[PDB]
């Protein structure tokens, strides 16, 4: 289950262990998983409803969620939340090839006029 | 081909002697050719070896022969003729690639102490494909390095 994104059956076989108490990896792995869930909603979403995050984190109520804001910091109240992607930085430069390339014409020259 | 000569009398050889007389093996480096022989030469006269004098100046000076200027090592050609040139060796490619097997198959059908003369009268790909292959991939190579540093060197 936690391989793929599969989150929700995680958390309803941690409340059913037929082994033993297992409580102390359990715990560990729940502080993994919410983070890296935070980790995820961070990126392709514009806008979500503030209940929307406690419904999605099992945390429901609890004035954690103020708190756990200001660790993922965010943005904005009014019931909602923002990000912000660039992701241009690789494209619109050539200048970056300039030197990689002249170095790679460089090698076929090298190894295509020497005698072996 | 330059040479030098010396008279000599004939009067001298009359006394059974002979002029230039030897004392070193240096002088008889190189052989005459049959048509000085031909000519009076030894009967009637004597080369003389030759040497030139060089210096470092001169030499220094004489190899800017052909040099071009700093300016015809960086234009990097139209956009335009490149491609048609392209295009035209394309096509002489693939048609000596067409020819190719119909001489590889019958390579050894034929006797091979005849084989040698069978291409006196008609090309072969194989020799005549490779100059195609060289002149292309050196236009190329060149014509993509010169864009390349010239897109950093100005601005």
Redesign the interface.
């Given at each position: 289950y936690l391989m793929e994104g599969s989150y929700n059956k995680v958390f309803l076989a941690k409340g059913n262990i037929p082994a033993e108490s297992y409580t102390f990896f359990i715990d560990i792995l729940l502080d993994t998983i919410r983070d890296e869930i935070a980790g995820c909603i961070e990126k392709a979403y514009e806008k979500i409803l503030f209940t929307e995050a406690t419904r999605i984190l099992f945390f429901n109520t609890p004035k954690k969620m103020t708190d756990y804001a200001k660790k993922r910091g965010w943005v904005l109240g009014p019931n909602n939340y923002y990000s912000f992607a660039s992701q241009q930085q690789k494209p619109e430069d050539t200048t970056i090839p300039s030197t990689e390339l002249a170095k790679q014409v460089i090698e076929y020259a090298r190894q295509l006029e020497m005698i072996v | 081909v330059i040479d030098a000569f010396r008279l000599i009398n004939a009067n001298m050889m009359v006394l059974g002697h002979e002029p230039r007389q030897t004392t070193s093996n240096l002088g008889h480096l190189n052989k005459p050719s049959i048509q000085a022989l031909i000519h009076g030469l030894n009967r009637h006269y004597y080369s003389i070896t030759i040497n030139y004098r060089k210096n470092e100046l001169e030499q220094k000076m004489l190899l800017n022969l052909h040099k071009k200027s700093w300016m015809e090592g960086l234009t990097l050609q139209d956009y335009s003729e490149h491609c048609k040139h392209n295009e035209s060796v394309v096509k002489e490619m693939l048609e000596l690639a067409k020819n190719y097997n119909k001489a590889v198959e019958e390579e050894d059908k034929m006797t091979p102490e005849q084989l040698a003369i069978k291409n006196v009268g008609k090309q072969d790909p194989k020799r005549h494909l490779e100059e195609h292959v060289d002149v292309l991939?050196t236009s190329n190579?060149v014509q993509?390095?010169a864009a390349?540093?010239d897109?950093?060197v100005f601005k």
């Open positions: - | 991939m190579i993509c390095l390349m540093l897109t950093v």
